[PDB]
Amino acid sequence: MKASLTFSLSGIYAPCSISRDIYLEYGDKKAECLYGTIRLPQYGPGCTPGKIVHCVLDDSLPFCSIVVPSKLFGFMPTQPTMDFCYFEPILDNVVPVLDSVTFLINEQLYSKLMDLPQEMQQIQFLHYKYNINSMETVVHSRDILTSGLCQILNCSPFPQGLVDFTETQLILVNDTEQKLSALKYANEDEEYALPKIGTNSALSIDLESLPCTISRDLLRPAPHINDDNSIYAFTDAETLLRLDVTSGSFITVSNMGCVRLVKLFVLLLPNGFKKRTIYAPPKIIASFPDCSVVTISKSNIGHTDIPIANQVFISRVGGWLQSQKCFQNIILTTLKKFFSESKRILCQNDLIPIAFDSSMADLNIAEENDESDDEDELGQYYKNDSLVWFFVTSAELDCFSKDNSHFIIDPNRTKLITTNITNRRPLPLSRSNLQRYYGFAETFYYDLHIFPYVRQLVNILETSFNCSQRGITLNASVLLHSTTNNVGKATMVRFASKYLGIHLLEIDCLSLTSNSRQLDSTSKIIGYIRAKCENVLPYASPAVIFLAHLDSILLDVNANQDPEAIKLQKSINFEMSKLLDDFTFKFPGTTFVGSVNNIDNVPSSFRSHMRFEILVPVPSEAQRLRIFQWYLSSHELNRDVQQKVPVSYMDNISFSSLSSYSAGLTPLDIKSIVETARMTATARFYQESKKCGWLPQSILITQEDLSKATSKARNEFSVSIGAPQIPNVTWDDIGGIDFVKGEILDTIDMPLKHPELFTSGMKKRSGILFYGPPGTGKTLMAKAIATNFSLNFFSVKGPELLNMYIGESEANVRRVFQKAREAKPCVIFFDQIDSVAPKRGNQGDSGGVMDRIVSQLLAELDGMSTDADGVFVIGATNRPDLLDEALLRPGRFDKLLYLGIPDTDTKQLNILEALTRKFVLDNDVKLIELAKLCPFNYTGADFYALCSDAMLNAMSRIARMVEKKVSQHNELTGENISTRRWFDKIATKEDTKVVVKMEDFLKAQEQLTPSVSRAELNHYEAVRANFEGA
């Protein structure tokens, strides 16, 4: 619903008011305290989640008018009161009570209240001081309640809801740090004077581009539609009066050259943008490079000074999409539309931006204009995505002169005339976003503090620019390459281009209209390449040529060569060399920026004449933080989606948790994970919508399913490379390994974490070797490692390496072991090394292949100089005497850790409870009783056998109970039934938990026996007593 708005003098805790008329259109005598909902119009991508408000009925309010407290939002009634909003009546007033709320309070009043020992005295103080009353009051997660004093610190999990101390814990927090001195809500403070604040004859303030779009329906005044269009300006404070001419006035002042008239407005009261500023759309700032302090004065004029300029001679800027047949038609048609649909003043030495959707493309539309009425389309469907600049160029003025700023084109008295092209340089992104204003496809914002390769390339382009702005032409060029796929090669070049205000061509080679086709048309392809490039350079500003996937066309010699294969190869190398070097003289300062996928595959000649080299890696954890910070941002979710209900994160999200758990993933995977989370949350939202329900105002992402999606991301990685997946084994699914978990965390966690303070010494502990009797978890530890940590889990299953032919090692072990270097940080798991690496001194006949494996394995493994790429090799053995001197304590695999028969007293209990994870037992038979009833010398996995066959007899009990119950059924109803119909017509839920009460334990203790006897233990205890030779 539309509603009119007004701000009351504010009690903050005082209710809003509901008008009698809305209390008739949605009148309900059972609910006179009608809880309203309001949407607050604002600057921003969309209206932030609306507020539930507690209200009192008022009959005095005019039609659809509503009043809310001012200072409840930190604004004061001295500021311009917004006259409208939107309202929603809450269906049946259905609202949940909050599960938890926390408050922050200053240490003085905190202690003054905590001095009261009787908690109810503080509860009454909530009433006496704050006039809070339960069930009446609704509270909101973070709202400051009084400057310097009380604040709500959180509501959880809901952002809003009812309160009652009968369920709401009312947590309090002490502001020891006095930040409440800074955390004051008051958006305005009274200035010491309005005079002497500059002089009304001349003010100087930094201009800024408005960080968002703004539209004719939000502004307070009422411009016309056909004229007054497009050009507007926005001001922040009593500055609106320091100009002597109020909001709604024109001003025209500029720092240099011609004047530029603009309509100036006060900002809407609900604004987040920093004051002491004059905000503008990109349209204005585009004409005024740097010089951010702008001259300002009253500068008023009596309406439009010039009513006609009888012809205009506009020109397009050069630039990538501005010079293609497939865009030409859409360009001219959108130009015609734009200029036809409204009347505007224009001036020489000025730019006009035009925006359109490049998807419209090869759709012509046959009848919408020129033979049809002026208002023609809903751009809701005829979208926008790409932007162009037209220079206004010359215009035919009348006898009047010099005041060119008012030129205007009557749609019948005047025409627009093409002059082919002009040259001008775009704004520097550092001062102003275009993209975030138009909402286009985004270009992620790096910062040179933490991306070394960006600092590199940006410095290269910066010098290539400025050195040739000075007298020294630079032929700078660079190639980007990477070890992995999918690192953001193009993104870097684009970002740099915007960050430096540098033009670019964007070209991809894959889309060339022919392959490396056998019949020679390398001429045709390289010709099309140059012919497409050259067209803009005659009017290019300083610019770069970016070539995507050079590897597709710079093939390289020798696999099996046709004569034509040689001719194509050499022809391509030659013509590319010529093309590039020629460009370096055809135009100065114009930089070739290539990209490639396998640096081994680029041909040697090109590899020599190329200049700089940059290797861009898979990002660090420190970088991951900023990656999530981007794609989880408000704008970066809100763009994609139609429905007016917005989305957000919960402020609980642990960026540490994501950055650690997402280790090794590439940026493109981080997008995948976040967008999957968005999907799952929306599915939850529509599941909620099945009932009248709660939380309808907005779905948020939450830490649980955002965590979960990592597992899918890792499996979809694994199916690309390294197909094996692993069943989950969470940390608590093992126990009774305390020393071993100690050392494993001392090896894989603490040296891996905290390199800000761990020196990351020049060598590292390579691995872990588990040895001992079978059935002591030494397999399970590996599946646990694969489950809980972010590490990937490559492995070979024992003698998976050996193979039929001679020369076994390159057929497997080399390819896999180097693949682990090729992968991101990942373990290699081994089992049965006593089978894979026989002690070389036990020489073998019949080709001695054990010597071949063992030699290659040591050579690929050890030494590890310049090679500490996290390649932890971890594994298990039965009997370590058969291990080679591969185990000799160089630290190449020699982190020996034993596992064995547990301590008698309670570690068997820790075993039983761990294996009882997600098991069920629900009586007075505490696990202490089981752990005492079991005799000793049973060990490890044999207790899993004891649970296994206890479970088997428990399900047997249930199966025979079912057999009885189904027999007694069939005797009385369903005389001809057996299975599917039976199970589909029973509906058990008390029985279906099928909990064992007891007795299955006792008959397990009768039926089970230790799987290795002491006479078997002695054979292991011997090697145990070798201590591997100590």
Ligand X SMILES: Nc1ncnc2c1ncn2[C@@H]1O[C@H](COP(=O)(O)OP(=O)(O)OP(=O)(O)O)[C@@H](O)[C@H]1O
Binding partner of residue 693 among Mg ion, another protein, ligand X, none, CB cut-off 5 to 8 Å per kind: none
Closest-CA residue to 256 (of 295, 284, 283, 285): 295
Binding partner of residue 725 among ligand X, another protein, Mg ion, none, CB cut-off 5 to 8 Å per kind: another protein
Site string for another protein, 710-729 (x = CB under 8 A): --------------xxxx--
What are the start-end ranges of the H helices in 152-236? Answer: none
Cα dihedral sign, 152-158-163-167:
negative
Binding partner of residue 485 among ligand X, Mg ion, another protein, none, CB cut-off 5 to 8 Å per kind: ligand X
- Among 315-323, 419-427, 777-785, 839-847, the segment contacting Mg ion (CB under 5 A): 777-785
Q: Are 494 and 548 in contact (CB under 8 A)?
A: no
Give 561-569 contacts, CB < 8 A, sequence gap 24+: 562/518, 564/518, 564/519, 564/520, 567/520, 568/516, 568/520, 568/522, 569/603
CA distances from 492 to 488, 671, 948 (A): 6, 17, 57
Q: Which of 667, 767, 875, 880 binds ligand X (CB under 6 A)?
A: 667
- Among 21-29, 358-366, 424-432, 730-738, the segment contacting ligand X (CB under 6 A): 730-738
Site string for Mg ion, 724-763 (x = CB under 5 A): ----------------------------------------
- DSSP labels, 1004-1019: HHHH---SS-HHHHHH
- Among 19-27, 54-62, 937-945, 998-1006, the segment contacting another protein (CB under 8 A): 937-945
Establish if 915 lies at the interface with ligand X (CB under 6 A): yes
Residues 739-778 touching ligand X, rule: CB under 6 A, are 774-778
Site string for ligand X, 936-965 (x = CB under 6 A): ----xx--x---------------------
Q: Is 452 annotated as a binding residue?
A: no
Q: Which of 134, 491, 638, 1005 binds ligand X (CB under 6 A)?
A: 491
Q: Are 494 and 627 in contact (CB under 8 A)?
A: no
Q: Is 775 annotated as a binding residue?
A: yes
Closest-CA residue to 171 (of 181, 163, 179): 163
Q: β-strand 591-595 against 478-481: which pairing, if any?
A: parallel
Q: Is 660 helix (H, G, I), strand (E, B) or coil?
A: helix
- In sequence order, what E strands does 150-220 have? 151-156, 160-162, 171-175, 203-209
Q: Is 863 annotated as a binding residue?
A: no
Q: Toward another protein, which CB reaches closer, 779 or 812?
A: 779
First to last CA, the chain: 84
Looking at residue 481, what DSSP letter applies?
A: E
Q: Which residue has the tokens 């080299």?
A: 613
Greatest distance between any 2 Cα atoms in the chain: 118
d(CA 508, CA 547): 6
Q: Toward another protein, which CB reaches closer, 627 or 791?
A: 791
The length of the chain in residues reads 1030
Q: Toward ligand X, which CB reaches closer, 366 or 441?
A: 441
Establish if 780 lies at the interface with ligand X (CB under 6 A): yes
Count of chain residues binding another protein (CB under 8 A):
24
Looking at residue 851, what DSSP letter applies?
A: H
Q: Which of 252, 597, 698, 1005 binds ligand X (CB under 6 A)?
A: 597
Q: Read off φ and ψ for residue 172, nearest 5 degrees.
A: -120, 145
Q: Which of 948, 953, 970, 1005 binds another protein (CB under 8 A)?
A: 948
Supply the minimum distance, in Å, between the C-beta of residue 838 and another protein: 12
Q: Which of 159, 542, 775, 880 binds another protein (CB under 8 A)?
A: 775
Binding partner of residue 452 among ligand X, another protein, Mg ion, none, CB cut-off 5 to 8 Å per kind: none
Residues 488-507 touching Mg ion, rule: CB under 5 A, are 490
Q: Toward another protein, which CB reaches closer, 342 or 835?
A: 835
Cα dihedral sign, 720-722-727-728:
negative
Q: Toward Mg ion, which CB reaches closer, 421 or 490?
A: 490
Establish if 835 lies at the interface with another protein (CB under 8 A): yes
Q: Read off φ and ψ for residue 65, nearest 5 degrees.
A: -90, 145
Q: Is 411 annotated as a binding residue?
A: no
d(CA 344, CA 326): 29
Establish if 779 lies at the interface with ligand X (CB under 6 A): yes
Backbone torsion region of residue 864, taken as left when φ is above 0, otherwise alpha when ψ lies between -120 and 50, otherwise beta: left
Supply the minimum distance, in Å, between the C-beta of residue 619 and another protein: 30
Supply the minimum distance, in Å, between the C-beta of residue 1012 and another protein: 8
Q: β-strand 84-89 against 100-106: which pairing, if any?
A: unpaired
Q: Toward ligand X, which CB reaches closer, 133 or 620?
A: 620
- In sequence order, what E strands does 846-995 have? 873-877, 896-898
- Among 325-333, 565-573, 926-934, 1011-1019, the segment contacting another protein (CB under 8 A): 1011-1019
d(CA 479, CA 616): 11
Establish if 454 lies at the interface with ligand X (CB under 6 A): no
Q: Is 774 annotated as a binding residue?
A: yes
Supply the minimum distance, in Å, between the C-beta of residue 670 and ligand X: 8
Q: Which of 798, 825, 870, 890 binds another protein (CB under 8 A)?
A: 798
Establish if 797 lies at the interface with another protein (CB under 8 A): yes
Cα Rg, the chain, nearest whole Å: 37
Q: Toward Mg ion, which CB reaches closer, 299 or 832?
A: 832
- Among 184-192, 485-493, 635-643, 821-829, the segment contacting ligand X (CB under 6 A): 485-493
Looking at residue 227, what DSSP letter applies?
A: S
Closest-CA residue to 630 (of 482, 451, 453): 451
449 burial type by CB count under 10 A (0-12 exposed, 13-18 middle, 19+ buried): exposed
Closest-CA residue to 186 (of 47, 49, 70, 82): 70
Neighbouring CB atoms inside 10 A of 82's CB total 19
Q: Is 779 annotated as a binding residue?
A: yes
d(CA 322, CA 529): 17
Q: Toward another protein, which CB reaches closer, 175 or 831?
A: 831
Establish if 488 lies at the interface with ligand X (CB under 6 A): yes
**Residue 324, Cα to own-chain centre: how many angstroms?**
34
Binding partner of residue 724 among Mg ion, ligand X, another protein, none, CB cut-off 5 to 8 Å per kind: another protein
Q: Are 487 and 667 in contact (CB under 8 A)?
A: yes
Q: Which of 292, 463, 486, 715 binds ligand X (CB under 6 A)?
A: 486
Residues 267-286 touching another protein, rule: CB under 8 A, are none
Tokens of 340: 């036809």
- Among 308-316, 402-410, 713-721, 909-917, the segment contacting ligand X (CB under 6 A): 909-917
Establish if 779 lies at the interface with Mg ion (CB under 5 A): yes
Q: Is the peptide bond before 755 cis (omega within 30 degrees of 0)?
A: no
Helices 813-822 and 849-861: angle between axes, nearest 10 degrees: 10
Q: Which of 911, 912, 954, 1008 binds ligand X (CB under 6 A)?
A: 911
Count of chain residues binding Mg ion (CB under 5 A):
2
What are the start-end ranges of the H helices in 934-1013? Answer: 941-970, 980-985, 1000-1007
Binding partner of residue 948 among Mg ion, ligand X, another protein, none, CB cut-off 5 to 8 Å per kind: another protein
Site string for ligand X, 523-552 (x = CB under 6 A): -------------------------x----
**Residue 505, Cα to own-chain centre: how many angstroms?**
28
Supply the minimum distance, in Å, between the C-beta of residue 914 and ligand X: 5
Residues contributing to the site for another protein (CB under 8 A): 724-727, 774-775, 779, 783, 795, 797-800, 831-832, 835-836, 941, 944-945, 948, 1011-1012, 1016
Residues contributing to the site for Mg ion (CB under 5 A): 490, 779
Residues contributing to the site for ligand X (CB under 6 A): 444, 485-486, 488-491, 548, 595, 597, 627, 667-668, 734-736, 774-780, 831, 876, 911, 914-915, 940-941, 944
Q: Which residues are annotated as a binding site for ATP?
A: 772-779
Q: Which residues are annotated as a binding site?
A: 772-779
